[PDB]
Amino acid sequence: MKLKLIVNDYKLLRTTINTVASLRKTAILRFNSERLTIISTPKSSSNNGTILRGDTGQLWCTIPHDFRLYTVISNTITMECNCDSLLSVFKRYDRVMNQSNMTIKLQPICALGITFEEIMHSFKVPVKLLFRAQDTRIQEPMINYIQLMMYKLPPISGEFGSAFHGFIRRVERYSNVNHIHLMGVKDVELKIIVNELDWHLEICWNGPLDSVISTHEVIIRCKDWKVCSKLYAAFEEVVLAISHDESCVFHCSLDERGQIIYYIARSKGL
Amino acid sequence: NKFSASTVHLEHITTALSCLTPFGSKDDVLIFIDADGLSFVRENNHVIKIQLLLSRELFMSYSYRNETEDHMKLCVKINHILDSVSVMNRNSDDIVECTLSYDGHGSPFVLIFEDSFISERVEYSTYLIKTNGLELDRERISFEAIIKGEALHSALKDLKEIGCKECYVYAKTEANDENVFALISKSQLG
């Protein structure tokens, strides 16, 4: 149970830290001896996971530590603490560096001994020690490739990155938007259709898009698209996977590789 | 496509739409499609009617491949169009090429906004048609006055500021160059 590390890649970890907080309360920190797997999924969260909320999307982001030292003795440790406390702590560290390295330690309920200086700052965030049997029930979704099609989204730093980001967020200017009906046709054209207003709106993209490897369609919610937009803003290598009336997967990566995978299920049937 | 019109001077169609707002703001709008140009007609309470016309010369492309009928009529609501273009004009500073389209009876009125990166497409639902009887007889004119726009706009603004529950117009030209034209108002001031 000896877990100690001094994380300094900082953006890669920060985006996960923020997106798990924005997704739902608390998060899972799977500290393997090689790879850290932050798992914000609804199956493991005891307040209306899908009771009237419909919050089904599961995030499986992996953070590497080679961040100064990775001493995971046990060696898989799986934890669960609220995202509010670590969000505040990270924000404080970010502001401090805006003005040393944060040492992290571990004390089936424990605490995290975050310690950093400029002043002395100690934050003992409560945490638990979810069991191995409970860990085994936390498995990543399996996604078929029989129809799954992926769209290589352009990097944000490129000329078309800002235009694509604006096109992605274009669906947020109508406050009566709940369901987004993605469309992808084969040079592939990616289209967004809205069918909940008095007029039939189709937000298309005529720019250059690459399809790494039949119209595939999937209807998702608007908040899922918001977090997808935030992820696209925070990453360069972003792949949009679209399963025909099954699911939508947002694959992000940072060049071993700190991949971020968001699995979004259909919020309706085509 | 039985009709297709493309333009980049979207300010002209914007002024056309803002000149159609005074005639009620949530009701039906008649659009007449002919070879000469694009016209919007609105009628209120059978007492007043407006008729704007966008000529072919305002669009680089104006096909009108329809051949069975010389003119095409469609009825679409104005609140839908206003609410759409209101949020579309958020980034109007971009180089937008508007594209009007209509495939005939039973097909929606399309309004595509392409910025060379995003091609927003809207299909407006067309409603049944309920507008010429309200036209003056060309052989019976009692007075014909040509007035400058700014002066008339100022007079109308003044009449609005005075209230002007009722209005009167005068047209007398005496023996000499005594052209008298006045806009009398029955307002709170008297």
SS3 for chain B is: CCEEEEECCHHHHHHHHHCCCCCCCCCEEEEEECCCEEEEEEEECCCEEEEEEEEHHHCCEECCCCCCCCCEEEEEEHHHHHHHHHHHHHHCCCCCEEEEEECCCCCCEEEEEECCCEEEEEEECCECCCCCCCCCCCCCCCCCCCCCHHHHHHHHHHHHHCCCCEEEEEEEEECCCEEEEEEEEECCCC
- Tell me which chain A residues have a C-beta less than 8 angstroms from the C-beta of B119: 204-206
Amino acid occupying residue A241: A
Residue A261 sits at the vertex; the CA angle it makes with A112 and A29, to the nearest 5 degrees, is: 15
SS3 A130: coil
Experimental technique used to determine this entry: cryo-EM
Q: Does A161 touch chain B (CB under 8 A)?
A: no
Nearest to A201 among B79, B114, B122 (CB): B122
Query: Is the separation of the CB atoms in A252 and A238 below 8 Å?
Result: yes
The nearest alpha carbon in chain A to B81 belongs to: A199
Q: Which residues of A touch B114 (CB under 8 A)?
A: 206
Candidate from B114, B119, B124 with C-beta closest to A199 = B124
Q: Is B12 left (phi over 0), alpha (psi -120 to 50) or beta?
A: alpha
- Determine how many CB atoms are found less than 10 A away from the CB of residue B110: 19
Assess B173–A contact: CB distance below 8 Å, yes or no: no
Selecting from A173, A202, A206 the residue whose C-beta is nearest the C-beta of B87 gives A173
Burial of residue A269 (CB within 10 Å: 0-12, 13-18, 19+) is exposed
Q: Do A206 and B114 touch (CB under 8 A)?
A: yes
Residue B58 to chain A, least CA–CA distance (Å): 26
CA distance, residue B6 to nearest chain A CA (Å): 17
Please tell me which of the candidates B90, B116, B122 has its beta carbon nearest to residue A199: B122
Yes or no, beta carbons of A201 and B121 under 8 Å apart = yes
Interchain CB contacts (distance < 8 Å): A and B:
52
Count of all residues that appear for chain B in the document: 190
> Computed from CA positions of residues B160, B163, B164, B166, in that sequence, does the dihedral angle turn out positive or negative?
positive
Cβ–Cβ of B118/A204 closer than 8 Å? yes
Helix axes A10-23, A83-98, angle to 10 degrees: 140
Q: From CA A24, how far away is CA A11, in angstroms rounded?
A: 20
Q: How many CB atoms lie within 10 A of CB B59?
A: 22
Is A35 in contact with A62 (CB distance < 8 Å)? Answer: yes
The SS3 of residue A2 is coil
Among chain A residues, the shortest Cα distance to B118 is held by: A205
Query: In sequence order, what E strands does chain A have?
Result: 3-5, 28-31, 36-40, 58-63, 70-72, 77-78, 109-117, 120-128, 149-153, 179-185, 189-194, 200-205, 216-221, 237-243, 247-253, 260-265
SS3 at position A227: helix
DSSP state of A198: S
Buried b (16+ CB within 10 A) or exposed e, A131-165: eeeebeebeeeeeeeeebbbbebbebeeebbebbb
Distances from the Cα of B171 to the Cα of A149, B145, B156, B178, B179, angstroms:
74, 8, 17, 11, 8
Q: How many CB atoms lie within 10 A of CB B73?
A: 15
Q: Which two tokens stand for residue A58?
A: 């599961």
Place of tokens 């009928």: B69
CA–CA dist A41, A60 (Å, integer):
8
d(CA A21, CA A84): 7
Contacts of A248 (CB under 8 A, 6+ apart): A182, A218, A220, A224, A240, A241, A242, A264, A265, A266
Nearest CA-CA distance, residue A220 and chain B, Å: 20
Residue numbers after which chain A is interrupted (C to N above 2.5 A) read 8, 44, 66, 74, 99, 107, 118, 186, 213, 255
**Cβ pair A206:B119 closer than 8 A:** yes
String of b and e for B16-50 (b: at least 16 CB within 10 Å)? Answer: bbeebeebeeeebbbbbbbeebbbbbbbeeeeebe
Residues on chain B touching A209 (C-beta within 8 angstroms): none
Residue keyed to tokens 């040492």: A103
Task: Locate A183 and state its tokens.
Answer: 């469309």
Q: In what order do the strands lie in the sheet with A58-63?
A: A77-78, A28-31, A36-40, A58-63, A260-265, A247-253, A237-243, A149-153
Name the residue of chain B whose CA is nearest to A174's CA. B87
Cβ pair B34, B70 in contact under 8 A: yes
**Selection from A216, A158, A161 nearest residue A191 by Cα:** A216
Residue whose C-alpha is closest to residue A226's, from A67, A18, A82, A77: A18
The half-sphere exposure of B15 on its side-chain side, counting CA atoms within 13 A, is 6
Are A241 and A251 in contact, with CB atoms under 8 Å apart?
A: yes
The string over B80-109, giving b where at least 16 C-beta atoms fall within 10 Å of a residue's C-beta and e elsewhere, is: bbebbbeebeeeeeeebebbbbbeeeeebb
| Beta-bridge partner residues of B7 | B98
Inter-chain touch A206–B120, beta carbons under 8 Å: no
For B38, half-sphere exposure in the C-beta direction (CA atoms, 13 angstrom radius) is 23
Start-to-end C-alpha separation, chain A: 48
Q: For the purposes of burial, counting CB atoms within 10 Å of the CB of B122, is it exposed (0-12), middle (13-18) or buried (19 or more)?
A: buried
Contacts of B84 in chain A (CB under 8 A): 199, 201
Q: Tell me which residue of B8, B1, B3, B2 sits closest to B114, measured CA to CA.
A: B8
Residues 115-134 of chain B with CB under 8 A from chain A are: 116-125
Cα gap B64→B2, rounded to integer Å = 6
Helix spans in A77-131 (H)? 83-98
Q: Taking the CB of residue A109, how many other CB atoms lie within 10 A of it?
A: 9
A187 burial type by CB count under 10 A (0-12 exposed, 13-18 middle, 19+ buried): exposed
Q: Nominal resolution in Å?
A: 2.9
Span between the terminal Cα atoms of chain B, in Å: 57
Q: Number of C-alpha atoms within 13 angstroms, CB side, residue A40? A: 24
For residue B154, what are its two tokens?
């100022």
Which positions ≥6 away from A29 have C-beta within 8 Å? A36, A38, A77, A78, A79, A80, A81
Give the pair of three-digit tokens for residue A153.
């989204």
Nearest CA in chain A to B82: A199
From chain B, pick out residues whose CB is under 8 angstroms from the CB of A198: 77, 79-80, 83, 125
